[PDB]
């Protein structure tokens with residue numbers, strides 16, 4: 190607990206940019222793209238007010254659009270007077286991916302009609318398309334094979350405070366080991382992380398901060414409409430903060446909270462607000478109506494685990510179940526606690542043999558070990574119960590492919 | 602099964618993709634259905650065997666579906682999963698190994714079920730070739746059968762050896778196969794693929 194992330198002061202004009210969303214549509218061959226930029230304003234609207242969106246490739250401008258405020262008709266009462274949408278045509282766009290993170294710079298400028306600037310906002314824009322077609326997750330029209338890992342925000346000395354040096358270290362180490370995707374383990378991450386994944390090329394699954402694993406039953410609060418406002422806040426604010434990042438390709442509703450009506454409501458909300466990304470959720474059997482992807486936790490390649498209400502099928506048998514059409518990506522597999530990752534080759538043989546088996550996220554990246562000091566003042570790695578803490582789960586906090594200081598395990 | 606096989610045609614659908622042979626195939630299908638449509642033991646109609654995939658097969662499958670909706674129709678030619686079958690019915694597809702032939706791939710039966718867009722049940726029209734000392738890996742097929750719902754079994758090839766009785770100089774009978782009668786280019790002992798001998802004596806694989 191504490192103030193573990195950065196605190197800052199922001200000064201904005203009275204008439205200001207309050208919100209903006211960037212969207213990229215494409216044609217069939219991806220030779221033509223449209224950048225849709227929706228900008229919202231706060232303060233008193235004036236007729237001289239303008240918004241310009243310019244797209245930049247390096248130092249070269251490739252597109253620009255200027256318009257006054259006032260969107261199209263939405264319903265019988267009109268449209269948003271304090272909003273504007275710009276459509277920038279891009280011919281032969283350079284496509285973002287994990288292999289080539291081609292990035293554009295979009296600058297949103299609030300300015301008067303005579304030309305004076307009031308406030309500028311900028312974001313990195315990647316031209317990519319994520320969709321599930323015929324049971325396969327496609328990126329830019331091609332089926333994806335997720336070489337993913339779950340990552341917690343952990344530091345052996347600073348706890349859960351993240352710095353840019355450690356983030357860059359983690360991303361470089363992941364890409365040097367042929368990882369192309371990262372799952373934000375069970376909460377939204379430090380904002381710089383998404384930017385770094387945009388610049389370096391990692392696919393990101395962004396997860397809402399919602400876990401109720403210790404509830405009996407697990408959906409006790411997530412099936413209660415009295416907790417729907419809290420969960421809805423935790424989902425909507427994450428999407429609103431991170432919806433512009435090209436590295437974010439999949440939304441996650443959370444982790445291990447059973448399956449309730451709140452999950453269905455929030456999945457539908459995400460699908461309505463941001464149709465450009467699929468939504469996944471594992472709780473309740475990993476194949477409910479609140480997931481676009483079958484995402485089992487630690488399902489095996491060939492052995493079924495028929496638990497009473499939430500069976501864990503083998504991933505090959507799961508695909509062929511009557512009525513099943515969705516792709517399967519394991520949200521957690523190949524538990525890396527200690528001397529682990531036996532049978533990894535079996536998972537990857539199945540991944541390359543079955544089309545709709547589109548990979549998974551290894552659990553997990555780094556051991557959540559802390560640094561204590563002995564009587565001689567020397568540091569050592571500590572796990573659960575080494576601080577005197579009330580009933581603990583000992584060494585089950587260390588499931589990483591690298592040590593806390595980011596030294597690789599042999600399983601890496 | 603209708604009396605329609607064109608295995609030796611090159612390509613196999615040379616006549617079954619020709620509308621000049623549609624009347625003959627249609628007779629061979631319609632008269633079989635008309636004769637046998639009242640029998641309760643008959644649960645599945647088959648369009649034939651190893652004749653490629655042509656428009657004649659599609660036409661006759663649709664005819665059977667119109668005339669007798671109470672039985673599904675299956676057909677293996679053309680890749681065992683075309684529009685002329687209600688059931689994926691591969692010949693000798695394996696449990697775990699894919700056999701990617703250029704135009705008619707033979708997937709493993711577990712991989713076949715999960716192919717994008719695939720919803721049909723899989724019953725092997727021919728599997729576990731019983732030629733001589735055979736049926737190794739039968740337990741693997743039946744493990745997969747009991748583990749995967751849409752894997753609904755198959756038909757072993759086959760029941761009885763098609764061996765004939767010849768007599769030696771001493772007048773004693775012996776089992777003969779292809780080429781023992783002087784017959785023009787033959788396929789030797791490939792006629793004996795049965796679980797029982799010609800006199801219906803069981804093989805050890807039974």
Ligand code: NA
Nearest residue numbers: 540543544546
């Ligand atoms: Na695959």
Ligand code: NA
Nearest residue numbers: 746749750752
């Ligand atoms: Na079955």
